[PDB]
Specification:
This is part of a larger assembly, with two copies of chain A and one copy of chain B. Chain A is of the alpha/beta class. Chain A is 33% helix and 20% strand. Chain A is built from 13 helices and 18 strands. In chain A, the strands form four sheets. Chain A has a five-stranded antiparallel beta sheet, with no helix packed on it. In chain A, helix 6 runs parallel beside helix 7, helix 10 runs parallel beside helix 12 and helix 11 crosses helix 12. Chain A is elongated. Chain B has no helices and no strands. By secondary structure, chain B is low in regular secondary structure. Classes of the chains: A alpha/beta, B little secondary structure. At the A-C interface, strand 6, helix 1, helix 4 and helix 11 of A face strand 3, strand 8, helix 2, helix 6 and helix 7 of C. The structure holds adenosine-5'-triphosphate (ATP) (2 copies) and magnesium ion (2 copies). The site of one adenosine-5'-triphosphate has 18 residues of chain C, from helix 3, helix 8 and helix 11. It is classed as chaperone.
Chain lengths: 476, 17, 477
């Protein structure tokens, strides 16, 4: 019953095998049960007090990890550097002699034995950001059809028809940018494309969730910035190496950068710090250089289109610049339909007029509420934009509208309904509740604007030809 | 006199056992 | 019978297991008195002179604490670092396969065996976020009934009634913005909310002591600033990760950004500083990002909401906006009633007019002081504001009342009463002391105004419709 263990090193024609055991190298004879032909270098074997190899086993799974330095000419050995800058030449085991063991890979190794087995880095923490795949799909996004069509053509279409693209000698777009006013739905598309990619990977390759999620990376913005000089660039290089490794000309890898302005700037706008002055060239070289990413798509989302560096906002890097505009009446109706589901409880007062037809009643309520909020009445007057020319312009609450505001209004209406059912005991959302929620929201978001706001007024000022000099809230 | 951040550079240390 | 100890590694169908003993891995059988199937990976087992398992013990060991980097894909091994920047792959023990393991958490490990037996939680601890539970409750705040009701509905109501919200498919708010003029009371509401949450965690659930301290992570504006590149972002990520991991279903965790105005200024504003273009994006990404908060409410108090970045004030990140208004006559009466309680010593001469009725005497004194503060006389004429048209609007001290001012008036009256006790020997409180305190405060606040002052134009010029072009101090002396 008491049996030892050891590490196989090499094989000979004398039916003998070299085994490292107890800190010493010995040569031993294999039992007749085991055949030496199937043995491979680095395999773990079982020993005994009689010192005979009895059975082979899987390779070692734990130990110190050492960054690979270089691959020797023979191919059976490689130079690897330890944690404290110690360099050793170690044999390469069977599994490493799949993806080539390219230099710069921290290989799992045993210093005493002198053999390698595996590797990995910290960029996987990005994959840990998307531990839960969002369940929102394209069916849950309303008011945007051309934008969804473009984003599907940029990502899903090239991989849906490989032969047609090959015949026309067309490659999938290298990058996609999404820009627009806050709350217009950029992150919704950003997470819907990730959900679709996860579904595709689950249905095509395998049902395992981790591998499916491994094809989407979430940067989160300034997560790359680090304390030490030259470490953020190394992190970016590792991220792009990880991206290029997973690509196979039929499996896209989507690296999503959120709030592009956080880490990318014009290299001169940095006042307190100029880390972007070094970060930007590294990413530019990674995206397009002597060696270019064959099958990697970079999706960036930002709220300040102009503040990004011109080099990034160039064809060949960010091919399609999708613009998401503030919802109009039709988009508002679509969003309300997406939120005011048919299954929500509705008061019998509302169903009395429409014989209990829930769908027709909800559609009529949605049309009434969107008409109420999209009304050019003196009660909806918000601001007076002036210019040097003098063409004073009256803006309404409808101009500063987005899907987030619609969701907030629906939530407030639901809260009012729940308060009413708690106090009185009659359930059901009412039409008057939505109107009250609208006016309360427009009252709550009244004293927001500051002295000067370059958020969305720059475009209007350029349209009118003159710059804004005064704005006032026109209430009471 | 705009306030500015900093990025440090580590110095290697010699440790045995 | 001397019996040794070893570390179990793995189990096999042959009823024999591998044990790390004396620095070597040995495959040994199990005695009939102990079940091999009941054994678990990374278990301290007992051995003997014949090298046979006789007992299995708890996962107790002394080992170095290593910072977790990342769990492997197979889910059984994890990468850790060391003091000398030494990285190792270690199998996870049975308890670590329990809360979800996260990077940056110290794990007790023995490098020789490479097993992480447990996770040390106190190694990664933050005391700056924790705040002492204040004594102030909802009953101690007056004049803000609507605001208190609104904040109650925003915070406490969803967690008390979860079934109804699930039935209506409604999620709790993901942010509250309390904003207003100085001294009107915003930290007080935060203290009341923190105290209510402490009570809910203490008596409703009864977990243990210090559990109330764990919730309501409180951070001030300047606290997050550091001297490095990409270090404040690390603090933001750490605090949001802590809030996410501590919160459970129906369990509310509130992060208070007191003095929101100073930090998180509008991007592109401020030539001297540029930290905003880094701190604000991290906050915008953490809240309502690709991966969203589940049961986290972010409360922000600011005297300059206009200064806050427009991207964070939009719905989805700060939904419920609550504006604190300056007290009116009824609010002033309520605030005075919140301070002039019946336990304060009252002079016998003070109670003589009402035959010793303390409640009626206090109510009458409160009415008198409120009337004195809210009387438009030459004594209360503070400033005159002249617009472009030239018309003058007279602003009194009543337009600059605040709960802090009322508390200071009461404290000054108490100090004067104690001075009277020390000098003349007559105990109690006098209404004339309150009147004198009013006069002293309104005379002291005469030199505060300047050519241009904040917090008044946004509330005056909107109704007037004319830009404020001059403010003049009224009669002096
Ligand atoms: N069709 C729609 N258009 C816009 N917004 C929608 C739509 N449907 C739902 N929403 C709501 O709008 C909210 C904001 O969307 P999203 O998170 O995509 O904007 P965002 O990318 O955060 O904007 P920013 O990054 O500028 O802050 C979401 O929480 C979502 O519930
Ligand atoms: N009902 C009330 N309304 C207003 N203030 C009150 C009330 N009750 C007591 N106070 C007193 O008002 C004082 C100031 O309150 P608080 O500290 O909340 O102002 P603040 O919000 O910090 O102002 P700022 O944020 O501009 O500094 C407190 O010390 C408190 O004792
Ligand atoms: Mg977004
Ligand atoms: Mg305060």
């Amino acid at each position: 019953p008491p049996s030892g263990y050891g590490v196989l090193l090499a094989t000979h024609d004398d039916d003998t095998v070299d085994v490292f055991t107890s800190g010493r190298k010995m040569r031993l004879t294999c039992s007749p049960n085991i055949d030496a032909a199937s043995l491979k270098k680095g395999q773990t074997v079982r020993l005994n007090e009689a010192l005979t190899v009895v059975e082979a086993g899987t390779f070692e799974a734990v130990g110190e990890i050492s960054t690979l330095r270089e691959i020797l000419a023979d191919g059976h050995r490689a130079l690897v550097v330890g944690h404290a800058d110690e360099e050793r030449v170690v044999w390469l085991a069977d599994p490493l002699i799949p993806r080539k063991l390219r230099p710069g890979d921290s290989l799992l190794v045993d210093t005493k034995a002198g053999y390698a087995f595996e590797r990995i880095p910290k960029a996987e923490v990005e994959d840990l950001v998307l531990e839960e795949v969002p369940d929102v799909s394209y069916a849950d996004i309303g008011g945007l059809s051309r934008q969804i069509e473009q984003i599907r053509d940029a990502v899903e279409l090239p991989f849906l028809h490989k032969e047609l693209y090959r015949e026309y000698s067309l490659r999938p777009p290298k990058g996609v940018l999404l820009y627009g006013p806050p709350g217009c739905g950029k992150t919704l598309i950003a997470k819907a494309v990730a959900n679709s990619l996860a579904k595709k990977m689950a249905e095509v390759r395998g049902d395992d969730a981790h591998e499916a999620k491994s094809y989407f990376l979430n940067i989160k913005g300034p997560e790359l910035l680090n304390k030490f000089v030259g470490e953020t660039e190394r992190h970016i290089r590792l991220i792009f190496q990880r991206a290029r490794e997973k690509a196979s000309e039929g499996t896209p890898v989507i690296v999503f950068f959120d709030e592009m302005d956080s880490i990318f700037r014009t290299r001169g706008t940095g006042v307190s710090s100029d880390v972007e002055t070094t970060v930007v060239p590294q990413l530019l070289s990674e995206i397009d250089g002597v060696e270019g990413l064959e099958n990697v798509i970079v999706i960036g989302a930002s709220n300040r289109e102009d503040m990004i560096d011109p080099a990034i906002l160039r064809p060949g890097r960010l091919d399609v610049k999708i613009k998401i505009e503030r919802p109009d009446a039709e988009a508002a109706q679509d969003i309300y339909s997406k939120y005011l589901t048919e299954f929500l409880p509705v008061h019998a007062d509302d169903l009395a007029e429409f014989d209990g037809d829930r769908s027709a009643c909800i559609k009529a309520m949605i049309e009434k509420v969107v008409d109420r909020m999209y009304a050019e009445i003196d009660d909806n007057r918000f601001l007076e934009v002036t210019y040097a020319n003098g063409d004073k312009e009256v803006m309404y609450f409808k101009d500063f509208n987005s899907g987030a505001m619609i969701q907030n209004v629906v939530d407030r209406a639901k809260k009012n309904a729940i308060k009413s059912v708690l106090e009185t005991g009659q359930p059901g959302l009412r039409i008057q509740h939505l109107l009250d929620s609208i006016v309360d929201e427009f009252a709550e978001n009244e004293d927001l604007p500051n002295t000067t706001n370059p958020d969305d007024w720059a475009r209007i000022s350029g349209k009118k030809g003159e710059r804004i000099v005064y704005i006032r809230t026109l209430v009471t | 006199g705009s306030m500015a951040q900093e990025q440090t550079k580590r110095g290697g240390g010699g440790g045995d056992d």
